[PDB]
Amino acid sequence: MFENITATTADPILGLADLFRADERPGKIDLGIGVYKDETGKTPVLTSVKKAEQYLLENETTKNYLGIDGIPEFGRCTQELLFGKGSALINDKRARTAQTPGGSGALRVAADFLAKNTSVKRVWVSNPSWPNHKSVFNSAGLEVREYAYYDAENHTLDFDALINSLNEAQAGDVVLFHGCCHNPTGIDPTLEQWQTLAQLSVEKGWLPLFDFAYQGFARGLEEDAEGLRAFAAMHKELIVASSYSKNFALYNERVGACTLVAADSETVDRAFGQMKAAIRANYSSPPAHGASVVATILSNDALRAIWEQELTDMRQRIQRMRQLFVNTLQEKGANRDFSFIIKQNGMFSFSGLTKEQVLRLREEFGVYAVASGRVNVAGMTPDNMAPLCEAIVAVL
Amino acid sequence: MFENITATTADPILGLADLFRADERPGKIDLGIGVYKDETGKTPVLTSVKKAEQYLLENETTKNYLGIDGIPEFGRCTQELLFGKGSALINDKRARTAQTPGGSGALRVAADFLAKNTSVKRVWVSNPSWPNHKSVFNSAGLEVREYAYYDAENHTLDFDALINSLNEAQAGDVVLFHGCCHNPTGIDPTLEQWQTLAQLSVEKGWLPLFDFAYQGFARGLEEDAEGLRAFAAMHKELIVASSYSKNFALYNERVGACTLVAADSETVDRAFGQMKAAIRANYSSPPAHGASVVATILSNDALRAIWEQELTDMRQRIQRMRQLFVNTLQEKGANRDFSFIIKQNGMFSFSGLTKEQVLRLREEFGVYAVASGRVNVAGMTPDNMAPLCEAIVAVL
Ligand SMILES: O=C(O)CCc1ccccc1
Ligand SMILES: O=C(O)CCc1ccccc1
């Protein structure tokens, strides 16, 4: 049965991990997959997380199955984070949340739900894209089409080209937006641009799907949700696939949520029934540990205070590395102004390197970035900055 | 977009949970979903598990993403459990294991892998069936057909009808077998019958898929894998979807594995590449905590000894409840010989109750069983036995 199966290429970001592991060169530097590293170049468990895990060790009395949609308190805390305490969406019971295995799991659940239960045939994503969107949506039988997004010459959001390319989207198409820290460009709509897109989306009949994996990493928890909230104020329906992987540094525990919004409580509950069916046909119920940690932290004032400071600390260290990167590139003799890197939000710099420059970086220098030219600024430290900048300058 | 979505019925086992929760009657008894309860009627975390969790709290230094196939040691320990230390399958590197979110996740991964990469169009399951097999395989676009299995009059495996009904399966069809503790009948092939089916399967060109969620609950860890091992000795290819939910009482941490077997190392590695692609398009990488616990216990002699005794203890308590159930039914005045219940393996008794008898049990008596007549013997205690048996006798 398996004799004639075609070989495939690996996940083009997660697959960097294996390459990096096999590399026996001592000075190798990982700027690939977007995980946060501290000053020492490691990716620690947050202190708030360790404290919550100690609590769970001492107080959990069962591993009995969670409901298909996971921990009720986790859903409640998620909706508050997404929409704001006192949101009309919450008051009017228009939102239902399933805890999922990561935002990736939430994306697949959304895709299966839409494919089976609606007339959706196409999802629009930005170019440049995040590779796994195509993989997930195609797996559920949905076409993926790309809209224009990034003006590579001014290093801004090309709002005109964005709007014009989306004129091709039909009513009933899905349009995927990154909530904040657009991956890979790090360029987000202004609040005013979010409000314009919200209005356009309503007029054009698009279904908004928010991929929201970086809440807290652009400006702050509440600020980063402004765009989503602008859409929520304007739409009857939308979906959010959110993640706690990055903002809790809980990557491997697979902690995310798929939140369904409809016009009213009757409609969302009936629709959510089919979302639960899409889960039943997949992994049945979500993993407790990571979601329990999140719910524990979010519902306890003291832990929440510690966690929010840790998140601020991560964002601030990345901002320091961002400035140091640009300074060091200059000092190392770069043949380009890299000032545009400062404008970018989140963990990355979308640096303008070509695919061949990134291949050479890996081959000759043991510096690992994504083929798109995306580099993980959150993986830079004072100790690895000089070598990595020397490498980049050498390939320009 | 969501206005016209059709309502659906809940997962017909997991959905019992909600019903049971809403029931405000004090004497309610849950004999539905197959989770183990101890003498006190609760479902404890195993001591071996708590010890492993303490170890992880004290010693984990990161939550960085696992590879798409999960923890390497977890795969190694899984293959040893499945095939035996020193198996030619392991020596010849013919097996590849992905850690998944439960056996349910492993079933979906297998289904997606097969649907996308092979000519498989149909999966054969037993009647009576486990409801979620149909849901999972249908979700990937595969037809599910049923083979005969249980002789309800002799309470044995109807081996003749099994073999005759499978004559309809074509070469290239998948045939799903439960490794041990067939759900819901509790009746398994003898070793000799396993060997006969292994031979038949090779002759007929079926792809064997083992659903192996109860290793340790029929007779013992090694004994329960005899049937799988009989198939592994005879086949070039097969798939195992295994679970640690029950044998580690780790239900909500979603700990399972999808193991792919091919003729040789080159074929399985190429095929496994596409299995990883099916994972990438789904939840991306598996949850660390529960799999870390399993790997920790399985690789440490002291913890492994404690865990294997805890598993023995669970099996033995269920066997005691099984005998007490039958005795109490007799004493309470049952109008049937229920001796056949003693022959059944695993957590359940497939009791012969009709769908209306189970509905009446829930409605009138607050005793919750599955609509098929399946009752969770592992949920019975000395304290709830009298009421539940009084209820059953009342509905006969
Ligand atoms: O590097 C990233 O783009 C974020 C981390 C990640 C990568 C691929 C799948 C899930 C998460
Ligand atoms: O009750 C069972 O049959 C086993 C527990 C279970 C039920 C449904 C999905 C996954 C596991």
DSSP per position, A191-213: HHHHHHHHHHHHHHT-EEEEEE-
CB A395 within 8 A of CB A367: no
3-state secondary structure of A2: coil
Radius of gyration of chain B (CA): 21
- Residue B128 CA: which ligand is closest? 2
3-state secondary structure of B322: helix
| Domains (range + CATH), chain A | 11-44+316-396 (3.90.1150.10), 45-315 (3.40.640.10)
Radius of gyration of chain A (CA): 21
- How was this entry determined? X-ray
Cα A125 from chain centre: 13
Q: How many CB atoms lie within 10 A of CB B354?
A: 13
* Nearest Cα residue to B35 out of B323, B377, B396, B305: B377
H helices present in chain B, as ranges: 14-22, 47-59, 72-83, 88-91, 102-117, 131-139, 159-165, 191-204, 221-224, 226-234, 265-280, 288-299, 301-331, 355-365, 385-395
* Set A124, A130, A194, A307: catalytic member: A130
Q: Decide the pairing of beta strands B256-261 and B238-243.
A: antiparallel
Q: From ligand 2's centre to the CA of B183, what distance in Å?
A: 9
Taking the C-alpha atoms of residue A359 and residue B126, their distance in angstroms, rounded to an integer, is 52
Taking the C-alpha atoms of residue B7 and residue A320, their distance in angstroms, rounded to an integer, is 52
Q: Is B39 exposed, middle or buried (0-12, 13-18, 19+ CB in 10 A)?
A: exposed
CB B381 within 8 A of CB B321: yes
- In the residue annotation, B124 being an active-site residue is answered as no
Q: From ligand 1's centre to the CA of A261, what distance in Å?
A: 25
CB A80 within 8 A of CB A229: no
- Amino acid B141 reads G
Contact A35 B64 (CB under 8 A): yes
Cα A110 from chain centre: 15
Q: How far apart are the first and last CA of chain B?
A: 48
Q: From ligand 2's centre to the CA of B13, what distance in Å?
A: 7
Sole residue written with tokens 């997004």: A149
Q: Decide the pairing of beta strands A348-350 and A374-376.
A: antiparallel
Q: Is A374 annotated as a binding residue?
A: yes
- In the residue annotation, A130 being an active-site residue is answered as yes
CB B260 within 8 A of CB B275: yes
C-alpha triplet A311, A315, A316: angle, nearest 5°: 115
B80-86, Cβ contacts within 8 angstroms, sequence gap of 24 or more: B81/B215, B81/B221, B81/B225, B81/B242, B81/B298, B82/B212, B82/B225, B82/B228, B82/B240, B82/B242, B82/B259, B83/B225, B83/B228, B83/B229, B83/B232, B84/B222, B84/B225, B84/B229
Q: How many CB atoms lie within 10 A of CB B26?
A: 6
Q: How far apart are the first and last CA of chain A?
A: 48
C-alpha triplet A84, A88, A91: angle, nearest 5°: 95
Question: What values do phi and psi take at A90, rounded to 5?
Answer: -80, -45
Taking the C-alpha atoms of residue B74 and residue B257, their distance in angstroms, rounded to an integer, is 9
Q: Does A171 touch chain B (CB under 8 A)?
A: no
Taking the C-alpha atoms of residue A387 and residue A338, their distance in angstroms, rounded to an integer, is 17
Taking the C-alpha atoms of residue B359 and residue B368, their distance in angstroms, rounded to an integer, is 8
Taking the C-alpha atoms of residue A250 and residue A310, their distance in angstroms, rounded to an integer, is 13
Q: Decide the pairing of beta strands B95-100 and B256-261.
A: antiparallel
Q: B284 in ligand 1 pocket by Cβ < 6 Å? A: yes
The DSSP 8-state label assigned to residue A171 in this structure reads T
Question: Which tokens sit at A251?
Answer: 């990557």
Helix then strand then coil, in percent of chain B rounded to 5, is 50, 15, 40
- In the residue annotation, B307 being an active-site residue is answered as no
Question: Which tokens sit at B338?
Answer: 């229920």
Taking the C-alpha atoms of residue A315 and residue A311, their distance in angstroms, rounded to an integer, is 6
How many CA atoms within 13 Å lie on the side-chain side of B185?
23
Q: How many CB atoms lie within 10 A of CB A319?
A: 13
Taking the C-alpha atoms of residue A269 and residue A266, their distance in angstroms, rounded to an integer, is 5
Taking the C-alpha atoms of residue B71 and residue B311, their distance in angstroms, rounded to an integer, is 23
3-state secondary structure A80-125: HHHHCCCCHHHHCCCEEEEEECHHHHHHHHHHHHHHHHCCCCEEEE
Sole residue written with tokens 């008051």: A91
CB A177 within 8 A of CB A210: yes
Taking the C-alpha atoms of residue B389 and residue B396, their distance in angstroms, rounded to an integer, is 11
- Amino acid B208 reads P
User: Largest alpha-carbon pair distance within chain A?
Assistant: 63
- Which chain A residue shows the shortest CA-CA distance from B104? A283
Mutate which of B11, B13, B135 for ligand 2? The one with the most ligand atoms within 8 Å of its CB, which is: B13
Whether omega for the bond prior to residue B128 falls within 30 degrees of 0, making it cis, is yes
CB A285 within 8 A of CB A242: no
Q: Is B34 annotated as a binding residue?
A: yes
Taking the C-alpha atoms of residue A392 and residue A370, their distance in angstroms, rounded to an integer, is 14
Which residues on adjacent β-strands are paired with residue A144? A123
CB neighbour list of residue A170: distance below 8 Å, 6 or more residues apart: A122, A205
CB A27 within 8 A of CB A390: no
CB B17 within 8 A of CB A67: yes
